Structures are given as structure tokens and as C-alpha cells.
Copies of this chain bind each other. A is one copy, B any other.
């Protein structure tokens, strides 16, 4: 925001009479710079976990695992997954105020997420702490199954049925995400909150702030001294206390947003880069895989679970 002209209405009078107050909007701008730099620091922290870019081989022979629904589409002009495009499609300043563009853009965000997906699918968890080593997908799955506490031969003796189940599950989750209209609640809430905040901030100007008149251009240099100072100082109390609550509801909002970001970063580092033993951390049930996706101002996860379903009485 532009403090001096916003609060004085570009008045030379206001100018040479308001120098009594001091550095108020200077530290206001200090706080605004602080929150602005915090935003980009958070974004870089969450999405800067990988040092080298990788790429998948062009031949798609992965033993039945049709990862097309999550892989980027080279044919389309934008190299994004079909579910990413579905998310992007379902998801849909003048009197001294400004809006800044983000430092990072969707193109390199998509590049980062695609590189992460390719690296993890190609080399399992090996690349998380050293040089990537190639290893077959069924052998990686056997390692995961031995990790959970089941003998490996079970996977071999049922791999076809397991692949069929996995393909069916991927199709069904695609159907569920296409059908689900209530998933975007938090992001919609944040956007609507910001919109309403700025709306009431701008609409504040039209009020008198208790003024015994309303014409802005004519009176306030028909008669400056005690009707100016009072109108503009109840205007500045109104303005800098709605911005006291503006800045500070924005900082507590950024505090909860940064707690969310910290938990998201931990989720990345544990569930996505490897396999976690903590119960009911990376979703409910048993945790095997992890697939991240991109969203406007948000991130989307995917999980793979193992569940038993047919017991029998025994002695």
C-alpha cells in the first residue's frame, strides 16, 4: 500500500500538517516487506528438496503399471498429468494499493514435480541420500513387501492379480477425484478470506469515519485546521487499526500457513522420499508409496495401502 497518498488523498495541506506523527507507515512497510519475503522463503523451502534433475526413459514398459494418469503428457502443449489438468480446470488496487507477482511460476513448479516423480519411480529411495542406482520395479516392490513383514514370494505368485487391482484402483481414484466437488475447501476458504479482507479495506474509504461532512475535494481545503486534523486522524486510527488487524491477522494466518508448510515438508521428506514406520502418519492403514502433485498455492498427495479382508477362525 501507499501510505501517504492513501491517507491524505494527495493533499499538500495534509502533507505539511501531518509531519507530527512520524515513521508509522515506515514500520508498516517494514512489516509488509517481512511478510512478502517470508512467502517466497516458505515456497522455496517446501519445493527445493532436490539438487539434480532427472528424466524418464522414453519406452513405457513397467510390468503393467499404467502410470499415464500421473505422468506428464508430451503430446499436450503443457507437460502436465491429466489429473493435474483436471485439478487446474476444476479449480477456478488503485487508490494506493498494489499486487505483486510470485517469484516462482507454474512451469518450473511442474518441472520440479515431474523430476521428483521420475526420480522416485526410476530409483526408489536410493537417490534420497546418494547417487541413483537402477533397480527393477518388481524387485523394489518385493523390498517394500519385505519391509512390511511379508515374505517376498507372495508378490511373485500373485503379481498379475496385484497389477490388475492396482490399475483398477488408479481408475477408481481418478473417477473419485473427478466426481469430488468438496476437496478444494481450504484453498477456496483462503482465497475468499483474502478477497473479503481487501474488499472491506477498500470499501472503508467511502465512510465518513464520523465526519460531519462528506464532500472530500471541496471542504477539506475550504476549512483545513480543526476539521481536517480530526477527520484525518479518526481516519488514520480507523485505517491503522484495521491494518493493525490486517497485518496481524495476516501474520497469524502466515503462522498457521507456515505450520502447515512445515508439516507438509516433513510429509515430503518422510512419506515421499522413503517409507515410514510411524502408524497412521502417511494416511490410514499400511503405507507403501507416495505421489505428489501440484495445486494453486497448495500441494496434493497420493498414498498406497495394503489391507487384509478375509479371515478364518482357528485354534
A interface, CB within 8 angstroms of B: 20-23, 27, 125, 128-131, 133, 200, 203-204, 207-210, 229, 237, 240-241, 244-245, 248, 251-252, 255-256, 259, 269-270, 273-274, 276-281, 284-286, 305, 307-308, 311
Q: When the two chains form their complex, are residues A128 and B279 in contact, meaning their CB atoms are under 8 A apart?
A: yes
Q: When the two chains form their complex, are residues A128 and B308 in contact, meaning their CB atoms are under 8 A apart?
A: no
* The one of B125, B130, B269, B276 that contacts A307, using a Cβ cutoff of 8 Å: B130
Identical chains in the assembly: 5
**Which of chain B's residues has its CB closest to A277's CB?**
B277
* The one of B255, B269, B281, B286 that contacts A129, using a Cβ cutoff of 8 Å: B286
Q: When the two chains form their complex, are residues B269 and A204 in contact, meaning their CB atoms are under 8 A apart?
A: no
* The one of B259, B270, B305 that contacts A279, using a Cβ cutoff of 8 Å: B270
Q: When the two chains form their complex, are residues A129 and B284 in contact, meaning their CB atoms are under 8 A apart?
A: yes
Q: When the two chains form their complex, are residues B279 and A20 in contact, meaning their CB atoms are under 8 A apart?
A: no
In the assembled complex, the CB of A37 is this many whole angstroms from the nearest CB of chain B, namely 12
Which residues from B are CB-within-8-Å of A269? 278-281
- Which 3 residue pairs across A and B have the least CB separation, nearest first? A274-B279, A269-B280, A129-B285
Which residues from B are CB-within-8-Å of A281? 269-270
Which residues from B are CB-within-8-Å of A208? 20
In the assembled complex, the CB of A226 is this many whole angstroms from the nearest CB of chain B, namely 11
Beyond A20-B210, A207-B21, A255-B255, whether A130 also contacts B279 by CB under 8 A is: no
Query: What are 13 A-B contacts defined by CB distance under 8 Å?
Result: A20-B208, A22-B203, A22-B204, A23-B200, A129-B280, A129-B284, A131-B308, A241-B244, A252-B255, A255-B255, A270-B278, A276-B278, A277-B277
